[PDB]
Design a protein around this ligand. Structure first.
Ligand SMILES: CCCCCCCCCCCCCCCCCC(=O)OC[C@H](COP(=O)([O-])OCC(O)COP(=O)([O-])OC[C@@H](COC(=O)CCCCCCCCCCCCCCCCC)OC(=O)CCCCCCCCCCCCCCCCC)OC(=O)CCCCCCCCCCCCCCCCC
Ligand SMILES: COC1=C(OC)C(=O)C(C/C=C(/C)CC/C=C(/C)CC/C=C(/C)CC/C=C(\C)CC/C=C(\C)CC/C=C(\C)CC/C=C(/C)CC/C=C(/C)CC/C=C(/C)CCC=C(C)C)=C(C)C1=O
Ligand SMILES: CCCCCCCCCCCCCCCCC[C@@H](O)O[C@H](CO[C@H](O)CCCCCCCCCCCCCCC)COP(=O)(O)OCC[N+](C)(C)C
Ligand SMILES: CCCCCCCCCCCCCCCCC[C@@H](O)O[C@H](CO[C@H](O)CCCCCCCCCCCCCCC)COP(=O)(O)OCC[N+](C)(C)C
Ligand SMILES: CCCCCCCC/C=C\CCCCCCCC(=O)OC[C@H](COP(=O)(O)OCCN)OC(=O)CCCCCCC/C=C\CCCCCCCC
Ligand SMILES: CCCCCCCC/C=C\CCCCCCCC(=O)OC[C@H](COP(=O)(O)OCCN)OC(=O)CCCCCCC/C=C\CCCCCCCC
Ligand SMILES: CCCCCCCC/C=C\CCCCCCCC(=O)OC[C@H](COP(=O)(O)OCCN)OC(=O)CCCCCCC/C=C\CCCCCCCC
Ligand SMILES: CCCCCCCC/C=C\CCCCCCCC(=O)O[C@H](COC(=O)CCCCCCC/C=C/CCCCCCCC)COP(=O)(O)OCCN
Ligand SMILES: CCCCCCCC/C=C\CCCCCCCC(=O)O[C@H](COC(=O)CCCCCCC/C=C/CCCCCCCC)COP(=O)(O)OCCN
Lengths: 70, 347, 114, 318, 115, 175, 83, 98, 105
């Protein structure tokens, strides 16, 4: 044997691992490494739009902290 | 069919009509129409046979089309003015579609073909319901929007209804089809005066309903659906034939009978406007309805037709079921003209 | 039907608060505690006038109060606040729940200093 | 960058389906005192590749009496829908983040039945037609109760968003709160995927190949892939809905591993159930779903509406 | 936009698989090969003849029971209202009405298939 | 002019309507209605109505499954008709397509009153909202208000559904 | 009281599914009216601030309205933290 | 109005026209009825979304409910007609005349 | 015809959903709340016939808000003139209408 069924299960598990890990890594790579923003409502979308406008590089992920307020 | 289920369906029909009559929201009025139709369809098929099935199918198709156009007119009115209240109907195209949909529901000419067919295909009780109770909701809606109504379309359909009712009734030997064409002509009379005075519409509706109830109850009492089967009633119950003759005379509009009152008041109201030609044509045309009522009276009451041997057995038995409101309906159908000024309480 | 009155572009200029959403969320509770009065004045003007052109000076006062608040935070609690808003910013939903140590340190800093 | 994500989702799913065929064959063999594939490749590891290459190099037949357009459309719809039903699943992050993910799965799954319907009708043969009407009956059997069970379970989530299910079950699995609903949902997913004991549409003993009897080669292969992808997807949905993995925002790999293990266990349970039971009669499935499942589901829906209000345990996010 | 791209990608992959399946292998079609399968003997009638539905009444009931699902789906949001007593009365009213309709059809033999 | 997505979706909606209105066969008509339901879901989605679009798509999928079964049972014949198998069906289909194309050209190049009012186009982005507020979906709150504001609607709807069950049982009784 | 007990036993012996369904439905119908936390759920629903609280103009005659969020006046959520 | 409004109204008119002209099958006309219902749903939803009328978001659900009732009614009548004639042709419903 | 049962008993069966300016959940306003409010207040109690004439201005404003026909007419006129100017080469549109602006929060 019954442990000879295991290689197929391992291959299936490796195949099924790929989507979740790939999605997580691609989300991190395209969002500054910090977990792509969720906007289920218009207020969060407005926050994201405001962030994009003040970044200066037209990207919402770049964040301006206390050094941007002189 | 279970009596409890039948009573529930009748109450659902009446609930839909009352919801139409008491609502202020267009959606609730449309819902009332849907509920009324849904409960009405099985009542037409209570005695199951192919003719009843065909009548129910035709009725369903006509009324579903009418309700679809009704909803579209409501939505167009909402689009051009965000109003759900039943009022002057701020859009003219929506008003035209609304008028056509309500005319389809009532059976006004040009859309009058379904009425003779559905009436002939169902039983006399179903016909009574269809030709009396089913006129209330569309007429109430038409009364509530009478100000925004276009006279040219409504008057055209009313005159066409009177003409077609008379001409179609001239050709019938089946009593249910005669009743249907009579209903078409009376609907035409009701809608002719609607743009001028809704009180006259209500008065005509009430008088017509009374006469129709009396006629249908007399027909149910003497189980006749054809002219020849009604020609036997004199040899079994002559009083029924005499009362039917007087009620038929009343339906014709001859004074001093109660039937004459709505036509008289509508003619007066139309002459209070300018409107001279239209009432003249309407009266001349109602002469045709009088003609075929008179032919029915000739066949059933004023002459005696040959009978059969087996009527002797029927002579020995009495009518089991008794209609408690038939005498009052006959009296109201015939002897009510002197109380005409009481119509003031209708407004 | 008449011309629409509009303020000139010069009348619309003001010192801008240019911090991202995560910084604002991190500082929001203390900002609402400290800058309450000008914000309430501006909101009352906004909801009574029903016209944005009549409450511009109040908006400028709101901006100045926010700038003063953030200048104080910079002057006294720079690093704890930076850690707190970095923590808040990492989250995709920007959740308060996942960073309580940083919030506690920032709260202690502001309570002692100010 | 988004196309890379689409490919990284859809290619591994097809590989998982291909190797699930082998895993099912081996599990059934070992439960039947035999081995299963173990010759072509070490431990039958190359058997799926051989099956696919044999099927795609085999002649495809268009029946003389069949409607050709629908006959070709049906497998395309099946495979594309099976691929699409994966995009809102959070693992722990979804490819497509929807406000109403659950309703999207409901609608797409109820669209998927037309693949079987149209293939069976367009084949223009009697066994295919019988399979198609069995599909109609099966959908009528399971749909209403499936939807009500979903609503009852999600009344504790607070929304229809799939990602909220992770935070809802942060401390306890949802199966400890709604295990009767979990049982009915499991049987409903068995019926929804045309799996034994509810594999009525194929009806192998009764109907030869049933709905897909006319189909051969590559077109036939597409139907098989769609069905097995649906198996895996429905079990992943069940794992997310009832056995909630704990998610660390700085280590999503742990969540992914745990979730994959759970869905693999559920798929192996599907294979076990197939190996263990006989087939229903398709009127008996409708009677089971309408006379036993439906009243209990309505009662439990009433209970799950009432319970959060009585206990002041209403979820957030109106 | 992303969902449209996903739909396009999936449909394109399925279409390409069909295209490869139909253009790669060798085709040898002749009339016997393409004839309808009925276990080795020619079918008597057509498969387009009417096929009776013994569960027709349950199918119509499915149409009505399906619309009550649309009425019950907004319930998660309805639980957030301030007047929880009116909402809970109305949710139970709808579900009791739906159970009564099942009880009526069950007792009138509406769930039994025609023979 | 922005990507014309809504206009394309509405055109495909009209095309599916023409497809099932030509009445080629019930099997084909149901397919056209399914396509129309899908594009209508898309049109409503592009306006913020996610719930309503998904709901109408689900409802029409169930309805068309029942219709497919009923077509197989009661509305079949030896040679079912397609849009190119009959001169009447093909003529109606082509007439509908040409009417739609004529109306589109007429309203797109000119600014004319077809029947009700006029229209110049510009894409339906213009009349949008630029509304910036909320932790909730306004459509969801409105639909959920059925259980607190719409008590009368709930009553009449539930009664009508129960009556519909009774009505279909009475109609199909036969005898 | 004696025939209904036998009816209950027969139903449990023949249709356990229906017995369970009816019991669950009845409990769900009657329990919410007897629970003390229903009003707690109502209060929690009423305490969720979806929209902005527009302040009131001071006319000098509202002692019960706070002049600052941290003032002792106004409603309190202290009951919620103990729940 | 925009182009989408005209397109939806055109779809309604086409479905109405489809219902008005009968071919042979009754089921086709029932499909046209459902199409009119769908068109009305889409039009009302677009109007209500555009004007941000919050309490009107629930009317199209009611419309769908009564559409389902109407479709069930039509299907029952079709079952009866087919049981009578073995076909759902509208040519067979000619027992009653005007 | 119309039996005002609601008015007689004070029930409010459907009046809550008749107009856009009537108590929406969470106080969410309609897009044309002010225009409908003014049209209703102006026409209240004077009857239908008088209202159609003396509240024509408020109703016209409300319909303009609802459908926005004059607004698109004006915008299309402006854009047509701008396109004509650029085609002959006499406008030179500003940098902030071409995407090279300096955005503000
Ligand atoms: C202007 C717009 C016009 C739109 C055209 C619609 C697209 C179809 C065009 C090609 C199909 C006809 C080819 C053919 O008949 O055989 C060819 C040829 C002839 O074979 P034969 O043996 O010599 O003789 C066969 C006989 O003639 C007899 O052959 P038959 O019995 O098979 O003929 C039936 C066929 C013949 O077609 C016709 O009769 C006239 C065509 C007009 C149909 C349009 C009706 C409207 C339906 C709704 C709207 C659909 C979208 C339209 C909008 C397009 C713009 C986006 O009609 C159909 O089957 C229509 C199916 C197409 C609809 C696809 C929708 C997919 C549904 C998925 C679910 C939806 C989800 C929600 C959204 O055989 C082949 O080459 C193989 C089959 C070809 C199939 C290819 C794929 C299917 C069609 C593409 C679908 C595109 C979807 C995107
Ligand atoms: C009880 O007897 C039975 C069995 O047991 C012996 C069965 O197995 C069984 C099921 C049939 C089996 C023989 C399985 C057959 C395997 C498939 C049909 C082959 C499908 C494999 C591919 C098409 C998957 C996709 C191909 C790629 C390799 C995947 C990657 C895709 C690219 C795009 C990359 C049946 C029906 C049965 O009755
Ligand atoms: C998994 C999905 C993604 C994969 C990505 C790849 C997708 C590949 C695309 C799908 C098709 C795959 C099939 C591959 C086999 C070739 C089939 C066909 O294209 O070849 C021939 C196409 O050729 C045509 O018959 C005529 C020849 C070319 C027509 C001239 C058109 C003008 C083109 C200009 C040519 C000049 C030089 C080209 C270079 C510039 C058809 O021959 P035919 O026998 O019927 O079909 C059976 C093929 N057999 C023999 C293998 C069994
Ligand atoms: C005179 C003859 C009487 C008997 C015949 C009655 C015929 C009609 C059937 C039922 C009568 C309808 C009256 C109820 C109308 C509902 C509205 C009213 O009751 O107020 C509601 C109160 O709701 C209560 O729960 C009463 C409704 C309880 C319904 C019980 C079921 C009765 C239906 C049975 C008959 C219907 C057909 C048969 C199906 C079973 C809402 O109150 P509230 O939420 O504070 O305020 C809303 C405003 N907000 C939003 C600003 C807050
Ligand atoms: C590789 C060479 C390319 C040739 C292209 C030919 C395309 C074509 O139509 O030919 C028909 C071709 C070959 O048939 P034969 O002539 O009999 O054999 C050929 C061998 N000599 O048959 C096919 O394979 C048809 C392939 C399907 C068409 C692909 C596009 C279909 C689009 C479907 C859209 C609907 C999708 C439904 C689901 C989506 C809903 C969300
Ligand atoms: C088939 C029907 C496809 C249904 C697709 C539904 C996708 C979906 O639900 O996602 C909704 C998603 C996001 O909405 P929310 O989750 O509420 O929040 C977003 C704001 N933060 O909305 C969208 O992305 C809309 C994008 C376009 C809408 C979909 C259009 C698809 C229409 C398909 C038509 C088919 C093509 C034409 C021919 C068909 C058959 C040949
Ligand atoms: C879904 C997962 C799998 C996807 C499918 C990918 C499969 C890729 C495997 C490629 C294997 C190579 C194909 C070999 C089979 C080709 C068809 C065949 O065998 O026919 C033999 C045939 C017989 O010809 P004759 O002797 O002249 O006539 C005798 C009849 N009177 O010989 C041929 O035609 C050979 C022509 C070569 C075919 C082209 C192969 C090239 C590879 C294409 C792969 C496609 C991927 C894209
Ligand atoms: C304090 C307040 C709490 C409120 C009450 C809560 C407790 C309620 C307790 C009862 C819950 C029971 C739920 C069970 C639901 C179905 C029960 C049932 O009766 O169904 C069976 C049918 O169920 C089945 O037999 C299933 C058929 C398919 C079997 C396929 C394989 C079996 C599944 C293997 C294990 C599945 C594990 C499920 C969960 C997986 C994880 C999600 C009825 O069929 P018959 O015996 O023929 O009788 C009906 C007519 N008299
Ligand atoms: C009070 C709240 C109510 C709401 C909650 C319930 C939610 C929904 C549940 C009801 C759904 C519909 C009910 C279906 C009715 C079935 C009618 C029927 O015909 O019953 C027979 C079975 O006979 C019965 O009636 C079963 C026994 C009587 C009904 C079941 C129990 C009724 C209530 C008993 C318990 C009451 C409360 C529990 C108290 C527990 C005591 C401590 C069905 O069997 P057949 O299919 O006909 O078999 C044919 C093959 N030979």
């Amino acid at each position: 044997m019954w442990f000879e069924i295991l290689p197929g299960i391992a291959v299936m598990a490796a195949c099924l691992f790929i989507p979740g890990m790939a999605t997580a890594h691609i989300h991190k790579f395209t969002n500054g490494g910090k977990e792509k923003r969720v906007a289920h409502f218009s207020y969060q979308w407005n926050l994201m739009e405001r962030d994009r406008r003040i970044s200066g590089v037209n990207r919402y992920h770049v964040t301006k902290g206390l050094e941007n307020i002189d | 069919m279970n009596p409890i289920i039948y009573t529930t369906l009748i109450m659902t029909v009446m609930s839909g009509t009352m919801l139409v009559m008491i609502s202020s929201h267009w959606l609730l009025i449309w819902i009332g129409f849907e509920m009324n139709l849904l409960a009405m369809i099985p009542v037409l098929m209570k005695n199951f046979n192919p003719r009843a099935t065909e009548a129910a199918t035709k009725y369903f198709l006509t009324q579903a089309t009418a309700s679809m156009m009704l909803m579209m007119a409501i939505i167009i009115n909402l689009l051009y003015s965000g109003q759900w209240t039943i009022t002057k109907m701020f859009n003219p195209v929506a008003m035209t579609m609304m008028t056509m949909a309500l005319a389809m529901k009532l059976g006004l000419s040009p859309f009058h073909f379904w009425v003779p067919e559905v009436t002939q295909g169902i039983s006399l009780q179903a016909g009574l319901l269809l030709l009396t109770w089913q006129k209330l909701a569309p007429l109430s809606v038409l009364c509530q929007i009478s100000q925004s109504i276009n006279p040219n379309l409504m008057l055209t359909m009313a005159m066409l209804s009177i003409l077609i009712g008379g001409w179609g009734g001239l050709n019938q030997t089946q009593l249910r089809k005669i009743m249907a064409y009579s209903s078409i002509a009376h609907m035409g009379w009701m809608t002719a005066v609607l743009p001028y005075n809704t009180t006259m519409t209500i008065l005509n509706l009430l008088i017509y309903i009374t006469m129709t109830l009396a006629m249908f109850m007399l027909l149910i009492h003497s189980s006749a659906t054809t002219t020849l089967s009604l020609s036997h009633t004199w040899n079994k119950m002559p009083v029924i034939t005499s009362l039917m003759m007087v009620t038929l005379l009343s339906m014709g509009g001859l004074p001093p009978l109660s039937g004459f009152m709505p036509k008289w008041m509508i003619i007066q109201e139309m002459t209070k406007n300018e409107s001279i030609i239209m009432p003249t044509l309407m009266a001349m045309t109602a002469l045709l309805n009088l003609y075929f009522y008179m032919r029915l009276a000739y066949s059933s009451s004023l002459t005696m037709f040959p009978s059969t041997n087996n009527m002797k057995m029927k002579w020995q038995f009495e009518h089991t079921k008794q209609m408690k409101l038939l005498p009052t309906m006959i009296v109201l159908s015939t002897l009510v003209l002197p109380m005409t000024p009481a119509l003031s309480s209708l407004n | 039907p008449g011309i629409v009155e509009l303020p000139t572009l010069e009348d619309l200029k003001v010192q801008e608060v240019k911090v991202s959403s995560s910084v604002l969320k991190a500082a929001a509770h203390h900002y609402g505690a400290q800058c309450d009065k000008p914000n309430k004045e501006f909101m009352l003007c906004r909801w009574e006038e029903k016209d944005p052109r009549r409450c511009l000076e109040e908006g400028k006062l709101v901006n100045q109060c926010a700038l003063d608040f953030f200048r104080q935070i910079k002057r006294h609690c720079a690093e704890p606040f930076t850690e707190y808003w970095t923590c808040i910013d990492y989250s995709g939903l920007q959740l308060f729940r996942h960073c309580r140590k940083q919030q506690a340190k920032f709260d202690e800093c502001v309570l002692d200093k100010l | 960058m988004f196309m890379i994500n689409i490919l990284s989702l859809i290619i591994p799913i097809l590989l998982a389906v291909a190797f699930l065929t082998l895993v099912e064959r081996k599990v059934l063999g070992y439960m039947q005192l035999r081995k299963g594939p173990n010759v072509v490749g070490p431990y039958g590891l190359l058997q799926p590749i051989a099956d696919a290459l044999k099927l795609f190099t085999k002649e495809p037949l268009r029946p003389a009496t069949s409607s050709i357009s629908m006959f070709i459309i049906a497998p395309i719809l099946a495979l594309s829908l099976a691929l699409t039903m994966w995009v809102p699943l959070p693992m722990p992050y979804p490819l497509i983040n929807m406000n109403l993910g659950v309703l999207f799965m409901l609608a797409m799954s109820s669209l998927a039945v037309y693949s079987i319907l149209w293939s069976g009708w367009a084949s223009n043969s009697k066994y295919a037609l019988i399979g198609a009407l069995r599909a109609v009956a099966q959908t009528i059997s399971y749909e209403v109760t499936l939807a009500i069970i979903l609503l009852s379970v999600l009344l504790m989530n607070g929304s229809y968003t799939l990602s909220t299910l992770i935070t809802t079950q942060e401390h306890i699995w949802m199966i400890f709160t709604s295990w009767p609903l979990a049982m009915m949902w499991f049987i409903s997913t068995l019926a929804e995927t045309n799996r034994a004991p509810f594999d009525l549409t194929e009806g192998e003993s009764e109907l030869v190949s049933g709905f897909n009897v006319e189909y051969a080669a590559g077109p036939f292969a597409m139907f098989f892939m769609a069905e097995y992808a649906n198996i895996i997807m429905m079990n992943a949905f069940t794992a997310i809905l009832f056995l909630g993995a704990s998610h660390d925002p700085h280590t999503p790999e742990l969540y992914t591993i745990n979730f994959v293990l759970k869905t693999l266990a559920l798929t192996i349970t599907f294979l076990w159930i197939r190996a263990s039971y006989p087939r229903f009669r398709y009127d008996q499935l409708m009677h089971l779903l309408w006379k036993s499942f439906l009243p209990l589901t309505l009662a439990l829906c009433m209970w799950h509406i009432s319970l959060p209000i009585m206990t002041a345990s209403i979820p957030p996010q109106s | 936009m992303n969902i449209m791209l996903t739909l396009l990608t999936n449909v394109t992959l399925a279409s390409l698989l069909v295209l490869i399946a139909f253009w790669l292998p060798q085709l040898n079609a002749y009339s016997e090969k393409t004839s309808p399968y009925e276990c080795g003997f020619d079918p008597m009638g057509s498969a387009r003849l009417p096929f009776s539905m013994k569960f027709f009444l349950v199918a119509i009931t499915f149409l009505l029971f399906d619309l009550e699902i649309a009425l019950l789906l907004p319930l998660p949001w309805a639980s957030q209202t301030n007047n929880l007593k009116t909402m809970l009365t109305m949710a139970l009213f709808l579900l009791i009405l739906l159970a009564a309709s099942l009880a009526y059809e069950w007792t009138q033999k509406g769930l039994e298939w025609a023979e | 002019m922005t990507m014309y997505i809504a206009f394309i979706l509405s055109t495909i909606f009209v095309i599916g309507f023409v497809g099932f209105s030509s009445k080629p066969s019930p099997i084909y008509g149901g397919l056209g209605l399914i396509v129309s339901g899908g594009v209508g879901c898309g049109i409503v989605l592009n306006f913020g109505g996610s719930f309503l679009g998904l709901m109408v798509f689900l409802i029409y999928l169930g309805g068309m499954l029942v219709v497919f079964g009923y077509t197989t049972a009661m509305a079949t014949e030896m040679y079912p008709e397609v849009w190119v198998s009959n001169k009447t069906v093909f003529g109606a289909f082509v007439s509908g397509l040409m009417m739609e194309f004529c109306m589109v050209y007429y309203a797109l190049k000119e600014e004319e009153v077809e029947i009700i009012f006029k229209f110049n186009g510009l894409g339906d982005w213009v009349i949008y909202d630029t509304g910036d507020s909320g932790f909730f979906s306004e459509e969801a709150m409105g639909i959920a208000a059925l259980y607190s504001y719409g008590t009368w609607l709930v009553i009449v709807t539930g009664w009508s559904l129960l009556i519909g069950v009774v009505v279909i049982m009475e109609i199909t009784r036969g005898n | 009281a004696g025939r209904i007990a036998s009816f209950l036993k027969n139903a449990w012996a023949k249709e356990p599914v229906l017995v369970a369904s009816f019991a669950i439905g009845g409990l769900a119908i009657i329990l919410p009216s007897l629970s003390p936390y229903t009003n707690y759920a109502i209060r929690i629903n009423r305490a969720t601030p979806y929209n902005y609280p527009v302040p009131l103009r001071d006319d000098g005659n509202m002692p019960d309205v706070p002049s600052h969020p941290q003032d002792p006046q106004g409603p309190s959520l202290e009951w919620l933290k103990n729940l | 109005m925009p182009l989408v409004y005209m397109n939806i109204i055109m779809a309604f008119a086409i479905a109405l026209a489809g219902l008005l002209m009968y071919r042979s099958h009754l089921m086709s006309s029932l499909l046209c009825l459902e199409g009119m219902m769908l068109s009305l749903f889409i039009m009302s939803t677009l109007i209500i979304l555009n004007t941000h009328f919050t309490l009107a978001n629930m009317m199209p659900i009611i419309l769908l409910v009564f559409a389902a009732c109407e479709a069930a009614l039509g299907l029952s009548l079709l079952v009866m007609v087919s049981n009578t004639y073995g076909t759902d042709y509208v040519q067979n419903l000619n027992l009653l005349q005007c | 015809p119309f039996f005002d049962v609601q008015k007689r008993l004070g029930l409010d069966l459907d009046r809550w959903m008749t107009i856009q300016s009537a108590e929406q959940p969470h106080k969410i306003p309609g897009r044309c709340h002010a225009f409908e409010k003014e049209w209703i207040e102006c026409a209240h109690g004077i009857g239908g016939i008088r209202a159609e004439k003396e509240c024509k201005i408020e109703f016209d404003d409300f319909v303009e808000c609802l459908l926005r026909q004059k607004t698109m007419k004006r915008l299309s006129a402006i854009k047509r003139q701008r396109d004509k100017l650029i085609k002959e080469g006499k406008y030179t549109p500003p940098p902030h209408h071409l995407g090279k602006e300096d955005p503000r929060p």
